[PDB]
Design an enzyme around this catalytic site. Structure first.
Site, PDB file in Angstrom:
ATOM      1  N   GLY A   1       0.770  -1.226   0.000  1.00  0.00           N
ATOM      2  CA  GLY A   1       0.000   0.000   0.000  1.00  0.00           C
ATOM      3  C   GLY A   1       0.805   1.282   0.000  1.00  0.00           C
ATOM      4  N   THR A   2       0.085   2.397  -0.132  1.00  0.00           N
ATOM      5  CA  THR A   2       0.643   3.753  -0.123  1.00  0.00           C
ATOM      6  C   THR A   2       1.495   3.955   1.123  1.00  0.00           C
ATOM      7  OG1 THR A   2      -1.019   5.040  -1.384  1.00  0.00           O
ATOM      8  CG2 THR A   2       0.031   6.113   0.510  1.00  0.00           C
ATOM      9  N   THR A   3       2.437   4.882   1.066  1.00  0.00           N
ATOM     10  CA  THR A   3       3.256   5.131   2.238  1.00  0.00           C
ATOM     11  C   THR A   3       2.665   6.281   3.047  1.00  0.00           C
ATOM     12  OG1 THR A   3       5.355   6.227   2.879  1.00  0.00           O
ATOM     13  CG2 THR A   3       4.871   6.085   0.507  1.00  0.00           C
TER      14      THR A   3
END
Lengths: 111, 250, 198, 233, 242, 244, 244, 243, 241
Positions: free
Chosen positions: F30-32
């Site tokens: 996933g996104t950071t």
């Protein structure tokens, strides 16, 4: 002891003409010997050309009207926007009322 | 969440064996040896305190428990399963009997009660049979002294003498030789110590041997006086010192 | 209340039960049959609270019939009554107890003797030669006490009964519109269709 | 692989995936296409009703949740019925208890939270239907895209279903154009139909076949079917 | 094992699909919707000449303005009918009117997916989907004569004509040609009676097939054998006439 | 044998819970997002992937507030994150209702911790597909936390998780050494804007949108607020500058 | 989930048989043999104690003959513990009947009730059947002396003489051979012992490996009496029948 | 068949693999700890290891304060450790309310052991991969150390050690007591007991510790507390001047 | 709390538990029933795997649900008991609330419903039974014969059989039962029944039982001899040819 009921007076009248009908009511709301409001509508337009009023104990009267209006809304949802015929509304109202047969809506209602 | 294991974990295999009962029994065969001998005026149960470390305090772990003032239990198999069985046993001893008849249950019944608990863990949904076998010894007024054995299956039987766990076969054999129907308690305790000595590898003294008996009433252990019908418990656990004194005359 | 009488003679049990049904100001019916047949040889008469009365009787009947079909056997009168007592004994400590009193008359085909059982709504059962519920005892017990004999023929019973009903019609304040009599014997339950002028 | 990790939603694959859900997401692309787009004054749903046989009806794909909110479905009808019905209640609750029309953005939150529960507990199954929700609330026009994975996103326009990517490209281009069709619903709809055709191939949207819904500034969410949409073919 | 409410990699519910298979094995059932009424016809299909053919109920009345035909595991439809009959009566009790055909149908389809082993969303207890399809036909003042097909999937479709059962795909294509927006009841009756004859294994007589309809005037009626017998004959003649 | 990784609460021979580890995989995919603890509060920031131009800018918010003083941000399965917040909010209301005082950050963390840990005890449930960075200000200081699907969590000086997790951590370790006295609310805001810009490289293929929030005793009065408008644009510039 | 470890104890084999029942039945076959023979003036129950020792306290033992009522007794074959569960509920049913009707429970009504319970574990519940078979010996004033049998399936039937447990086939043949309607209790006792004596799997047949019970109507009384023979009594009856 | 290794049912050898593997998890942290009994106090040393630099050192602990009197150290994953810690605190609070006196260290251990015994028998509950060491100065028993494992087993020790290098610490301690011939550190101040503890911890692990490599808890009459980095440092400096 | 779906669909659209339940029925002893013009007859065979029974007590195949309706079956005995009880109760309940005993079609429809319910409920397996229910509706003389199976399906027959070799005996009946002239006599109806059974029972005087049901709760079961006399005269019809 706590009394769940009250009386807010007022009076209403419904007369069915031949190609029309009227439902009127005074706009006074009281408690004992005081006036709560000189203008608090008591007769309502609930859609599908139906006017209703629940006179008596205002709190119960409001609950019922609110509950009925919402009853109409779902009728349209569950029945392809079908119009609620007055005779059908009445039968519906009966069930709404009798549902609280042992803790009644202290109102005399007319549509 | 919610235990969704509402089906038996113990079922019948084609040969008609009940796997888990079997495996549990296996787990029991590995347990430290424990035995019981019934004399004419008492019963003796004993096992070995296999300290899992010299830093552990052998005392803070009894394998011999009092269930009622006239009933004691001991086991072979999984210690934790034994411990909770003891709590359940002491409680049912009250709930299903004392709080009804005003007296403690008779050995056979209490045993019968524990056996019921075990039977269930053999058929109820989402559980495994207890991994232990117990030897319960007690005395009630109308039945006198008795010794019973209870298995993971829930089956139980009365013995004159018997042993469970590791060297059970060897011990049972040594017991069949020395046991007779005219034994006195002390005689049994002696036979007990001897039989146990065979199953003991390392040190064999009153600090590594846990032994208790069911015999005369111990007024000195009642805690109060003034009730002639209350004479004290028939269950007494021997002290480290009391063991040794009898080992010297071994 | 209603009349509920019962008399155990030599070879049968007789049950007399009033026919009136009053509801407030008027008498709705004058031909009420206050009885149910539990089995071919067991009869139960009942009196009490408006609805409970019939509901209970019919509930008990349904259960005996079910028992008969299941075991293809007819429970003894003694058994049927113990069942009925237990039902009432429960009802007594419930939220809304059944207010029914009953008389159970039956012929035990096994002992070859008639039996009469009296049970009140409290679950109080007792076996008697003759019995009555409510006020009825008050008017007829002195008569029965006098004229009763264990070896009375069925005809002698109906005569003693007739006497009791007359005393009831005389000294009792209400018009219970006469009774309906029934006999239970080794041959089943039959109704004396002629007690209007016997 | 997959064969052992797709037995139920409560299981993660070794790569960190939830196949049961992904499988759900698939029932979507197998459903008829539908489109949604909005200006600053309106939001439109143009859905392609699909028929089984040439004697069957073209199953309804637009449902009204309230006077100011509605959605289009693509996938399992039953599930949309469930979800739309739940959305109908949440709207109702907001009006009844607070006398407040429910925020379109909040309806998304709700739906998301409902779908999520069917992806972490054993015994259940993800919803097999995608939804497009439009609505005019206190902060203007809104368009929402609901995915069974429980992912809801706000967009100016979009479409889901079979060949969805067709109209989705169209819109991604026609953007600067329609995001300004304020004051004229007739044009937004025409544009919504020009996007839905961007995903045709089989036939050509007919009268009893097409279906459009609209809501906005001075327009309560309403559904147009048949002849009512004729002036758009 | 594998969950009864699991998705296939293609996004389908196994139990529902396998359900649709059991249905393909059922006795053929056909319905045609005209502006003069809706006709429902079924294939009795007894499994022995000893079985009394008229005790085969595959066409039932939901209400006086609604009736339906079933195909597939018929015992599975008993509760569906009960529920349908109850919904129509209940709706009437509450509103003093006739339940709309679509509504009755939608109500029935709500049970459909109510199966599983503890599915999160309420309390759907029912180990498996129904193994039967239903053709619900009826009339109501708002949308006139209507014909609906209810599946175990939970979804339902409206058709002008539809066939379900063993000879479904075959009989369907047949209907594709034969059906037109101007059919008359008489025509539909014959037509149904005809297609049945084609797809049926047995030689269609008035003892192994049954007709019925539902018109605004007389409501839902099931044609007694004698009335069917002559319709069979009237069919034979118009066919042997070219 | 094998299969130790099909059911949740199952211990594998080496003592691991594979299902949890598999969950972590969805987290890395996933996104950071990160968190920076300053001298009197915390800053939260997260990367938002712009799938296309159809996404309304600034709308699809991802950071969430629990109560009035707590901020939460997570990477991984978005829906699982919300669910955790929902529980967090309930857990917080319960606490304030009984104790009057709003829930202390340490306490709030254990609440989330115990609940997440719970989803690793039965095979009837799936672990949480997200890592969560959260914190706020309380009776005694600022606190920053990060929670793993295993239900594990600790206090942090700085924290990051997601696709670009390593870039971040690096950037963070730098900030930690170069500022032993403690960064500032104002500072951390831009600083965070940078670390996301860098950490975005591991995802440079798609365009994104920055989102920052903060909780500072002096800059927000201890309440969790979003960085919008000017202060936002100012830190977006500071990023676009040091990215070159 | 859990579905994985579910044995599905209540399903049909492709042949229409009940796996678990069959297997339980198999388990039963390895149990000490029990015999029930009904005479004109009584009923005899005899059973072989499976496995013993010199130290096994026999006086204080009971593993095959249980008293359910004062007119009904049963012989057990299979899991002792499973039997005790059923036996106790059986004793309760008997007393409920007595309290409800004020008459002793008719032998068949009790046997059916208990069989119905067994049948339950056969159709629902996901639990294992009870590994037990019973021989019911009782008397009631409707059918007089009766002899029944029930197994894990939940099925029961009546007999003049029957056996359960190990070597039923061999025993059933020896009984079907020397049994005669007009038998007498003393005659039955003898047949019972002979049968067991010839179907054992052990050396000889000593008292210490037997349980014996009889339900007679003791002429000098007029009522029914159950007698569970004591070790010494079995030792006696064993010498007279000529088995020393 | 192979499922007898996934849930807590018996293996044909009469074993419970899940319980075993759970024991395995207890070392996942790679941390060693030990406890010793003073003349009137109880001390537990545990290694404190902080890898990530971004971690707030103050929040990394495996030592717990269950009640004003009971202290507990956990060898195993932090989530399970915290689960066990919460339950233990609840249990100790409730016991007070219901019985009118502070829950005894040994009783609390027994209670926690019984709970573990359960995950061992019931199939839907997994064992907690941890070992719990409870310490206090019980009002009846005095300085006390009781430890429980995932098997549901528990016992009291004169001193004990847990972790990957459990054996060395144990034998190191075993030795000292064979020599001293008593079952406790014959020191008056807990400070010297803490020092003895840390010393032997070093001999056995063959490692030097700074004020941030350790974690210390002390139990005394009516109180259990944990030393701070500085409190520790003061301890480290003391054992310096001697060696 | 156990609710595992035991009866579920398979790829080909089959429900194997219901399927296998049927398999258990085949294995059960044969049962037959034939309706006359003023009666219905039910015949069943008796296994002989073990004979040393007590015919008095041992449960007999034909059972009465009510004074005017009987039920016979084939399949798992234990299961048949459950259905019977449930039917006998629903019988008394119906009399209690409608004040009229059940029709045969009703009582049948009920039993079928019960069986059906067990085919799609969690944690339960279908009944390994099939049944024949016969009797006379109250105040009616027209005979009634119905049959039910595990799937929950039911229907009426002029004559029908279930169980082992039912395949056989059914055929017999198909070419021996004239709807144009059903057994006008109780006697010629019981015979037609015996005949059909002999096609499979193979010399079983003690292996054949017959129960006759007539209007108005007239239900009687024949004795060995009464049947023995039927068997006897039937092997004479054969021998004289």
């Amino acid at each position: 002891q706590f009394n769940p009921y009250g009386d807010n007076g007022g009076t209403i009248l419904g007369i069915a003409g031949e190609d029309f009908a009227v439902l009127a009511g005074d706009t006074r709301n009281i408690t004992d010997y005081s006036i709560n409001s000189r203008y608090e509508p008591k007769v309502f337009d609930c859609g599908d050309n139906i006017v209703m009023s629940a006179n008596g104990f205002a709190a119960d009267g409001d609950a019922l009207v609110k509950r009925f209006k919402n009853s109409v809304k779902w009728y349209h949802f569950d029945h392809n926007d079908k119009k609620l015929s007055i005779n059908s509304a009445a039968r519906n109202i009966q069930h709404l009322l009798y549902g609280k047969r042992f803790f009644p809506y202290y109102v005399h209602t007319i549509i | 969440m919610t235990d969704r294991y509402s089906f038996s974990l113990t079922t019948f295999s084609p040969s008609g064996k009940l796997g888990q009962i079997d495996y549990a029994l296996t787990a029991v065969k590995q347990g430290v040896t424990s035995l019981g001998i019934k004399a004419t005026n008492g019963v003796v149960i004993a096992t070995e305190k296999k300290s899992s470390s010299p830093l552990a305090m052998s005392e803070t772990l009894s394998k011999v428990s009092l269930l009622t003032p006239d009933i004691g239990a001991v086991y072979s198999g999984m210690g934790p399963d034994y411990r909770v069985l003891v709590d359940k046993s002491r409680k049912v001893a009250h709930t299903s009997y004392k709080r009804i008849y005003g007296e403690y249950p008779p050995t056979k019944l209490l045993v019968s009660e524990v056996a019921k608990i075990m039977q269930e863990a053999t058929q109820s949904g989402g559980v495994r049979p207890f991994g232990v076998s117990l030897l319960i010894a007690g005395h009630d007024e109308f039945n006198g002294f008795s010794l019973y054995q209870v298995d993971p299956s829930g089956s139980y039987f009365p013995w004159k003498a018997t042993a469970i766990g590791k060297g059970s076969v060897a011990a049972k054999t040594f017991l069949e030789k020395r046991w007779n129907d005219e034994l006195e308690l002390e005689d049994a305790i002696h036979i007990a110590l001897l039989t146990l000595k065979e199953s003991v590898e390392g040190e064999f003294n009153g600090d590594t041997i846990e032994l208790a008996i069911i015999g005369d009433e111990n007024p000195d252990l009642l805690g109060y006086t003034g009730i002639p019908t209350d004479k004290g418990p028939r269950f007494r656990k021997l002290t480290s010192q009391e063991i040794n004194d009898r080992l010297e005359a071994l | 209340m209603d009349i509920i009488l019962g008399i155990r003679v030599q070879d049968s049990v007789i049950l007399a039960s009033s026919k009136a049904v009053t509801r407030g100001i008027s008498v709705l019916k004058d031909s009420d049959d206050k009885t149910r047949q539990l089995s071919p040889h067991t009869l139960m008469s009942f009196a009490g609270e408006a609805g409970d009365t019939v509901q209970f009787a019919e509930y008990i009947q349904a259960n005996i019939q079910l028992y008969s079909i299941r075991e293809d056997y007819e429970l003894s009168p003694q058994a049927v009554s113990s069942f009925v007592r237990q039902e009432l004994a429960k009802s007594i400590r419930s939220r809304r107890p059944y207010q029914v009193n009953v008389l159970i008359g039956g012929y035990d085909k096994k002992k070859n003797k008639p039996e009469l059982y009296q049970i009140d709504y409290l679950g109080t059962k007792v076996e008697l030669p003759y019995g009555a519920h409510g006020y009825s005892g008050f008017y007829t017990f002195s008569l029965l006490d006098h004229h009763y004999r264990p070896d009375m023929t069925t005809e002698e019973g109906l005569d003693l009964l007739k006497l009791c009903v007359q005393e009831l019609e005389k000294r009792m304040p209400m018009d219970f519109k006469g009774v309906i009599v029934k006999i239970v014997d080794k041959d089943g339950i039959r109704q004396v269709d002629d007690f209007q002028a016997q | 692989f997959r064969n052992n990790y797709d037995g139920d939603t409560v299981t993660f694959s070794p790569t960190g995936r939830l196949f049961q859900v992904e499988y759900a997401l698939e029932a979507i692309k197998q459903g008829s296409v539908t489109v949604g787009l909005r200006s600053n004054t309106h939001a439109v749903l143009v859905a392609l009703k699909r028929n089984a046989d040439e004697l069957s009806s073209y199953q309804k794909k637009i449902i009204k949740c309230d006077e100011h909110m509605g959605l289009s479905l693509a996938g399992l009808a039953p599930d949309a019925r469930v979800l739309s019905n739940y959305l109908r209640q949440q709207c109702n609750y907001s009006s009844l208890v607070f006398n407040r029309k429910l925020a379109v953005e909040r309806a998304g939150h709700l739906l998301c939270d409902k779908a999520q529960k069917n992806t972490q507990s054993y015994g259940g199954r993800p919803y097999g239907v995608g939804l497009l929700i439009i609505g005019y609330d206190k902060s203007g026009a809104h368009l929402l895209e609901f995915q069974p994975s429980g992912n809801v996103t706000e967009l100016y326009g979009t479409a889901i279903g079979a060949r969805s990517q067709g109209a989705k490209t169209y819109l991604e281009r026609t953007l600067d154009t329609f995001i300004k069709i304020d004051g004229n619903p007739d044009e937004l709809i025409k544009a919504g139909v020009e996007a839905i055709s961007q995903s045709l191939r089989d036939e050509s949207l007919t009268v009893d076949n097409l279906s459009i819904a609209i809501v906005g500034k001075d327009t309560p969410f309403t559904i147009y079917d048949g002849e009512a949409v004729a002036k758009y073919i | 094992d594998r969950g009864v409410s699991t998705f296939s990699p293609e996004g389908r519910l196994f139990q529902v699909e396998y359900s649709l298979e059991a249905i393909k094995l059922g006795s053929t059932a056909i319905g045609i919707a005209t502006k003069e009424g809706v006709v429902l016809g079924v294939e009795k299909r007894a499994t022995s000449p000893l079985l009394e053919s008229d005790s085969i109920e595959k066409i039932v009345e939901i209400d006086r303005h609604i009736g339906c035909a079933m195909s597939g595991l018929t015992a599975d439809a008993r509760s569906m009918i009960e529920h349908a009959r109850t919904a129509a009566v209940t709706h009437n009790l509450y509103y003093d009117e006739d339940i709309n055909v679509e509504s009755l149908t939608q109500s029935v389809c709500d049970l459909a997916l109510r199966f599983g082993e503890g599915a999160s969303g309420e309390e759907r207890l029912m180990s498996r989907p129904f193994g039967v399809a239903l053709l619900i036909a009826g009339h109501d003042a708002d949308d006139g004569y209507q014909l609906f097909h209810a599946e175990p999937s939970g979804t339902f479709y409206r058709y002008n004509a539809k066939a379900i059962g063993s000879g479904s795909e075959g009989a369907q294509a047949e209907l594709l040609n034969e059906w037109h927006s101007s059919l008359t009841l008489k025509e539909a009756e014959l037509l149904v009676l005809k297609i049945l004859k084609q797809v049926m294994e047995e030689k269609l007589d008035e003892n192994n097939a049954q007709l019925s309809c539902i018109t605004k005037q007389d409501g839902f009626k099931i044609y007694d054998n004698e009335k069917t017998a002559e319709l069979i004959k009237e069919l034979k003649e118009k066919e042997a006439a070219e | 044998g094998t299969g130790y990784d099909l059911s949740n609460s199952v211990f594998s021979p080496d003592g691991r819970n594979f299902q949890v580890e598999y969950a972590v995989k969805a987290v890395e995919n996933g996104t950071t997002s990160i968190g920076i603890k300053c001298n009197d509060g915390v800053v939260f920031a997260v990367e938002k992937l712009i799938t296309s131009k159809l996404l309304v800018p600034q709308k699809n918010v991802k950071i969430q507030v629990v109560d009035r003083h707590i901020g939460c941000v997570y990477s991984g399965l978005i829906p699982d994150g919300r669910h955790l917040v929902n529980r967090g909010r309930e857990e917080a209301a319960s606490f304030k209702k009984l104790y009057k005082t709003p829930i202390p950050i340490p306490a709030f963390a254990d609440r989330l911790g115990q609940y997440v840990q719970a989803h690793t005890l039965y095979n009837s449930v799936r672990p949480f597909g997200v890592s969560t960075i959260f914190g706020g200000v309380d009776k005694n200081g600022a606190h920053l936390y990060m929670l793993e699907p295993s239900g594990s969590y600790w206090g942090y000086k700085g924290a990051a998780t997601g696709k670009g997790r390593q870039s971040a951590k690096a950037e963070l370790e730098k900030l930690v050494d170069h500022h032993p006295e403690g960064l500032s609310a104002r500072e951390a805001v831009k600083q965070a804007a940078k670390i996301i810009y860098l950490a975005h490289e591991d995802n440079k293929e798609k365009d994104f949108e920055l989102e920052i929030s903060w909780c500072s005793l002096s800059e927000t009065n201890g309440l969790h607020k979003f960085v919008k408008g000017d202060l936002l644009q100012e830190a977006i510039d500071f990023a676009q500058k040091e990215i070159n | 989930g859990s579905r994985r470890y579910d044995s599905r104890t209540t399903i049909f084999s492709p042949e229409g048989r009940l796996y678990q029942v069959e297997y339980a039945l198999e388990s039963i076959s390895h149990a000490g043999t029990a015999i029930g023979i009904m005479a004109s003036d009584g009923i005899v129950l005899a059973a072989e104690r499976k496995v013993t020792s010199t130290l096994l306290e026999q006086d204080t033992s009971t593993e095959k003959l249980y008293k359910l009522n004062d007119k009904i007794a049963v012989a057990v074959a299979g899991l002792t513990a499973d039997a005790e569960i059923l036996i106790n509920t059986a004793r309760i049913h008997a007393q409920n009947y007595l309290k409800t009707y004020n008459e002793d429970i008719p032998v068949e009504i009790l046997v059916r009730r208990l069989s119905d319970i067994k049948q339950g574990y056969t159709q629902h519940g996901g639990l294992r059947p009870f590994g037990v078979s019973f021989i019911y010996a009782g008397y009631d004033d409707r059918y007089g002396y009766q002899l029944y049998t029930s197994n894990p399936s939940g099925n029961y039937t009546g007999w003049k003489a029957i056996s359960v447990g190990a070597n039923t086939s061999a025993a059933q043949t020896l009984l079907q051979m020397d049994y005669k309607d007009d038998m007498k209790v003393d005659d039955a006792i003898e047949l019972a012992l002979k049968t067991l004596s010839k179907t054992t799997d052990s050396s000889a047949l000593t008292y210490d490996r037997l349980e014996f019970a009889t339900i007679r109507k003791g002429a000098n009384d007029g009522e029914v009496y159950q007698k569970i023979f004591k070790p010494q009594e079995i030792k006696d009856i064993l010498v007279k029948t000529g088995i020393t | 068949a192979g499922y007898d290794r996934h849930i807590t049912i018996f293996s044909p050898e009469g074993r419970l693999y899940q319980v075993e593997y759970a024991f395995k998890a207890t070392n996942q942290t790679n941390i060693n700890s030990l406890a010793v009994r003073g003349k009137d106090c109880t001390v537990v040393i545990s290694q404190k290891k902080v890898p990530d630099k971004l971690l707030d050192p103050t929040t990394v602990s495996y030592i717990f304060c269950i009640s004003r009197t009971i202290g507990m150290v956990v060898n195993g994953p932090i989530p399970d450790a915290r689960n066990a810690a919460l339950r233990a605190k609840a249990e100790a609070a409730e016991f007070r309310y219901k019985y009118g006196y502070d829950m005894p260290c040994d009783v609390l251990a027994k209670r926690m052991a019984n709970l573990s015994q359960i995950y061992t028998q019931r199939a839907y509950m997994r064992p907690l991969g941890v070992i719990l060491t409870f310490v206090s100065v019980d009002e009846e028993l005095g300085p006390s150390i009781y430890k429980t494992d995932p098997a549901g087993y528990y016992v009291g020790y004169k001193a004990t050690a847990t972790g990957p290098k459990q054996q060395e610490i144990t034998t190191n301690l075993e030795n000292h007591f064979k020599k001293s011939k008593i079952d406790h550190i014959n020191e008056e101040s807990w400070e010297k007991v803490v020092e003895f503890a840390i010393t032997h911890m070093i001999d056995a692990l063959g490692t030097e510790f700074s004020k941030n490599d350790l974690e210390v808890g002390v139990a005394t009459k009516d109180k259990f507390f944990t030393l701070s980095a500085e409190n520790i440092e003061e301890r480290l400096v003391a054992i310096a001047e001697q060696d | 709390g156990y609710d595992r779906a035991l009866s579920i669909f398979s790829p080909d659209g089959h429900i194997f538990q219901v399927e296998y339940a049927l398999e258990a029925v085949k294995r059960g002893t044969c049962a037959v029933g034939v309706k006359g013009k003023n009666c219905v007859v039910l015949g069943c065979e008796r296994r002989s795997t073990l004979k040393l029974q007590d015919t008095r007590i041992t449960p007999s195949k034909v059972s009465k649900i009510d004074s005017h309706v009987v039920l016979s079956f084939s399949g798992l005995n234990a299961d048949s008991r459950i259905l019977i009880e449930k039917a006998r109760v629903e019988a008394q309940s119906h009399r209690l609330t409608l004040e009229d005993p059940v029709t045969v079609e009703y009582l049948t429809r009920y039993v079928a419903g019960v069986q059906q319910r067990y085919t799609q409920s969690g944690g339960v397996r279908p009944f390994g039974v099939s049944t024949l229910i016969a009797g006379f509706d109250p105040r009616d003389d027209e005979p009634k014969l119905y049959q039910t199976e595990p799937s929950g399906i039911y229907s009426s027959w002029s004559a029908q059989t279930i169980g082992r070799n039912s395949k056989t005996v059914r055929e017999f009946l198909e070419k021996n039962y004239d709807r144009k002239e059903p057994p006008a006599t109780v006697e010629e109806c019981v015979k037609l029944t015996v005949r059909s059974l002999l096609e499979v029972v193979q010399t079983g005087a003690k292996n054949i039982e017959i129960t006759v049901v007539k209007p108005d709760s007239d239900i009687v079961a024949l004795s060995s001899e009464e049947i023995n006399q039927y068997v006897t005269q039937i092997e004479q019809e054969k021998q004289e040819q």
